[PDB]
Amino acid sequence: SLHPSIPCPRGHGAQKAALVLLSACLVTLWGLPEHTLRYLVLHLASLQLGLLLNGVCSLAEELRHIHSRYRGSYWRTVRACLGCPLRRGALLLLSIYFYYSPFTWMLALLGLSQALNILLGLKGLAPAEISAVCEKGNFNVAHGLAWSYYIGYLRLILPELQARIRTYNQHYRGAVSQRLYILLPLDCGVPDNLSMADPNIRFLDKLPQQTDRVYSNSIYELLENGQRAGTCVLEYATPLQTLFAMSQYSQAGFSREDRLEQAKLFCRTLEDILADAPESQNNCRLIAYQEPSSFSLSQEVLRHLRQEE
Amino acid sequence: SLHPSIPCPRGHGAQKAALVLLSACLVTLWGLPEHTLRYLVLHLASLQLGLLLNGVCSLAEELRHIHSRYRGSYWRTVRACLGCPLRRGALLLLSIYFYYSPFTWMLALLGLSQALNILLGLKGLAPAEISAVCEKGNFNVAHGLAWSYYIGYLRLILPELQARIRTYNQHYRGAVSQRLYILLPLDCGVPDNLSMADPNIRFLDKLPQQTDRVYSNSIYELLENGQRAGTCVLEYATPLQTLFAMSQYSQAGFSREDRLEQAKLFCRTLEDILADAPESQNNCRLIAYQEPSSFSLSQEVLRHLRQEE
Ligand SMILES: CCn1nc(C)cc1C(=O)Nc1nc2cc(C(N)=O)cc(OCCCN3CCOCC3)c2n1C/C=C/Cn1c(NC(=O)c2cc(C)nn2CC)nc2cc(C(N)=O)c3oc(C)cc3c21
């Protein structure tokens, strides 16, 4: 409705043309009794056991990710596989009602059939269905936030940064490390400053220019037992402020479980980009955390600081 | 490898546990000849015809989107459905080799079975499989670019903008319209300035402040036949510079077909956000274009300008 090449969203034409081929194929059965209907649900059973066997093998992948992806909860993992046990398991019981009115040997034939369907890669997802699951969930916001952060901000501020650090040391007493530490709070909730987030980190300063775009940089000196054992540059992650603010934007249904699944994905993608980047080979260093026994993040920065040298 | 709650990417444990249940179910067949193997491919045929029927009904959706999503090319639409005709159609012919060694009535039983499987929503995609297709393609960069553009930039610059426009008119001769026009070139290729992109648009100016964050909004006056019939504020789309620069970033396999599928998706999502936004009810106005007979975009801005009043 904006440009003729702009694709409109998907409609219900998949369901619409489904009943047409249903009504076409149903009247062919009128071309020939009642003997078919016991065979119909038995074949309809075999589609469900194939889907049920496709769930349990994918469950073997999921137990690798019980702690991270599913917070140690065994019930969510079974709920994550198999789609919907209600609409699947109901027709499975209805089949055995019709099945009575060498079964394991008959059951074993469909067993290995679905195995090679997975092994040969025959369970293919079409690029129509691959696309239609991607534009369905409007909050797929994780790779765009990672890729635009590297392109728009990190590609620009990192190669200049080493010169802005050394001129502060030529200006002086306090030796600041030559890396950029980006904090990634998973409980996203980003405040404006950092003195209130931890009173162990209570500096403020402005990193000077080179001597266009003006990226103000503040150096926060850790005050381990009231003493600045470490001085460093700390910035938050501006994409995490967006992920927070979409959840507060209640006109879009973005919940705190949907936010936490992307913020973990945002750190994995941003760790990938800084692996093979020309500029961040030794400059960037992400410090992710999620504090509930809420410990001090000033310690874990100092662990990342003393591991530098 | 960064935090213990950060989920690792998926492995080949789906294929790994598939052969284990294959080797388990195969030796149960040793517990009982050769009579099963003709029945096995016949059941393996019925899975493919169900997938083939699932492709053709989804094709009925795709013909609504032949021009936009598939550039008018009928062959891509069939290639977009059904996944892979090579690995699917080969086993279909191999079945009929085994089928010879009321068939349409037997074929009609599996026909309406897959219809109600689509009609009742029984073809469910599990949230494990829904997720694993989303983190597979690392360039899913369309909604993050739209949502962060509204949050980080458009939510901040639009409610201030009306005051910055009127003070230019109080300063004066030239009545500038009270809207923001964002250009979305689909052939993304964004240049730095706009005088070279069209010599019909050749102003430069700086929109003044209110009298924190400083945004330079340049006012470009249309020079219809060398005369400034229209004066307006034109900005490009900074997310489209990123989508271009990921394609030039050849370490990530982002091709010009992958870029063009997201840039169309970026404009549909950004049109959605400005529909139900409190600030952009009459301020923003997107002008998307893709020029090959490459016409002048200064005309289509003036069409959007004279349609205002
Ligand atoms: C953000 C929404 N968005 N999403 C996508 C995708 C594209 C855009 C977008 O439209 N960006 C944008 N175009 C603008 C045009 C003007 C103009 N006409 O003047 C002004 C702007 O804002 C003035 C400076 C900002 N000030 C100071 C910094 O905080 C805010 C106020 C503009 N901005 C705001 C963002 C600018 C970049 N930017 C970032 N951004 C990110 O890291 C980020 C996170 C995600 C996700 N994507 N990115 C993009 C990389 N952090 C910044 C911090 C400092 C700093 N410390 O000084 C700093 O200095 C400059 C020069 C830029 C800069 C920053």
Residue numbers in the entry:
A (entry chain A), B (entry chain B): 5 to 36, 40 to 108, 116 to 186, 191 to 229, 237 to 317, 321 to 337
Sentences from the paper on this structure:
We resolved the cryo-electron microscopy (cryo-EM) structure of full-length human STING bound with HB3089, which allows us to reveal the conformational changes of STING transmembrane domain (TMD) during agonist-induced STING activation. We prepared the cryo-EM sample and collected the data of full-length human STING bound with HB3089 using a Titan Krios G3 electron microscope. Through data processing as illustrated in Supplementary Fig. S5a–c, we obtained a 3.47 Å reconstruction of the agonist-bound STING with local resolutions ranging from 3.0–5.0 Å. The cryo-EM analysis revealed that the asymmetric agonist HB3089 rested into the pocket of the LBD, which showed a two-fold symmetry appearance due to the imposed C2 average in the 3D auto refinement. LBD bound to the agonist HB3089 mainly through hydrophobic interactions and hydrogen bonds. Notably, incorporation of a furan ring in diABZI increased asymmetry in HB3089 and an extra hydrogen bond was formed between incorporated furan ring and Val239. As such, the inter-Cα distances between residues His185 at LBDα1s C-terminal, which is used as the measurement of the LBD conformational change, is reduced from 52.7 Å in the apo state to 44.0 Å in the HB3089-bound state. Meanwhile, the two connector helices of the HB3089-bound STING revolved about 45° on their own axis in comparison to that of the apo human STING, and the two helices slightly moved away from the two-fold axis. As such, the inter-Cα distance between residues Val147 on the connector helices increased to 8.8 Å from 7.6 Å. The two monomers of the TMD rotated anticlockwise, which is accompanied by the slightly inward movement of the outer transmembrane helices (TM1s and TM4s) towards the symmetry axis. In addition, the TM1s themselves revolved significantly on their own axis.
